[PDB]
Amino acid sequence: MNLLIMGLPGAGKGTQAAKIVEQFHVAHISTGDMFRAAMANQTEMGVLAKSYIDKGELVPDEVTNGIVKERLSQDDIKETGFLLDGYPRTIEQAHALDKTLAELGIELEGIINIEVNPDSLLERLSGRIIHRVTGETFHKVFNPPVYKEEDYYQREDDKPETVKRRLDVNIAQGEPIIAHYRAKGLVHDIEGNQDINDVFSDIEKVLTNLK
Numbered sequence: 001m002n003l004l005i006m007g008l009p010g011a012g013k014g015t016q017a018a019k020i021v022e023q024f025h026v027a028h029i030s031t032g033d034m035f036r037a038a039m040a041n042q043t044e045m046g047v048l049a050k051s052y053i054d055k056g057e058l059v060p061d062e063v064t065n066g067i068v069k070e071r072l073s074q075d076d077i078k079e080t081g082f083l084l085d086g087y088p089r090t091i092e093q094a095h096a097l098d099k100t101l102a103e104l105g106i107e108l109e110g111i112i113n114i115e116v117n118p119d120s121l122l123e124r125l126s127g128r129i130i131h132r133v134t135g136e137t138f139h140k141v142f143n144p145p146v147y148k149e150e151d152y153y154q155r156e157d158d159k160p161e162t163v164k165r166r167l168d169v170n171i172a173q174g175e176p177i178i179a180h181y182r183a184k185g186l187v188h189d190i191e192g193n194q195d196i197n198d199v200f201s202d203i204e205k206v207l208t209n210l211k
């Protein structure tokens with residue numbers, strides 16, 4: 001399957017991606033993960049990305065498109081399918097993606113659009129804790145771990161003032177992107193305001209209705 005998953009920050013893209021990958025075995029491509037990996041390994045791209053990510057701002061499109069395209073162009077994806085998560089995040093990236101996909105002879109089969117009440121998102125991100133090895137996320141109230149602190153951390157961009165900036169930035173950029181793909185008949189709206197397993201149940205029905 002060739003899929004996009006999108007939603008505002010904290011809407012549960014990563015949480016749902018993990019469950020999607022477990023069942024459908026698509027390749028998870030998360031720009032967020034790629035940036036954070038670059039940072040932790042102190043690559044050049046990591047140093048530049050940090051200055052944006054620490055502020056809750058979008059990383060420039062050219063760097064973002066390039067790394068996505070690099071991933072999309074590799075030999076795996078043709079036969080395994082992917083789940084693009086956190087990209088495209090600007091309409092420019094959407095156009096870049098579409099061109100890139102056409103060149104490669106790859107077609108999007110669906111967009112999973114997780115809709116969540118924006119009033120829920122500050123709390124989702126403020127309570128997030130992250131398992132180090134897997135990057136699996138938990139929530140101290142809504143989805144607590146079975147704890148041991150050495151195994152967890154909190155994302156730098158999850159401090160409330162950064163979250164508030166992230167939300168503003170992405171509420172403005174997300175509307176033209178969803179419309180772009182809805183116009184192509186590719187958008188599936190998911191009720192994100194449920195338990196994690198109920199959200200997944202909805203997504204699973206969508207994915208087993210494709211193709």
Ligand SMILES: Nc1ncnc2c1ncn2[C@@H]1O[C@H](COP(=O)(O)OP(=O)(O)OP(=O)(O)OP(=O)(O)OP(=O)(O)OC[C@H]2O[C@@H](n3cnc4c(N)ncnc43)[C@H](O)[C@@H]2O)[C@@H](O)[C@H]1O
Pocket residue numbers: 007008009010011012013014015016031032033035052053054056057058059060061064085086087088089090093124125127128129137138139140142143166192193194195196199
């Ligand atoms: N294409 C791009 N172009 C330019 N710049 C880019 C870019 N991509 C990334 N960047 C830059 O990198 C930065 C980070 O990007 P990125 O990592 O992609 O962040 P994001 O899109 O804001 O998404 P998050 O990981 O913060 O939220 P999520 O929806 O995956 O939530 P989760 O599943 O963990 O869940 C959140 C919390 O809620 C809990 N939770 C999940 N579901 C539920 C539920 N139903 N009920 C209750 N709690 C829930 C979870 O346990 C967790 O605690 C960007 O801000 C930007 O600077």
Ligand SMILES: [Mg+2]
Pocket residue numbers: 013014015032
């Ligand atoms: Mg995520």
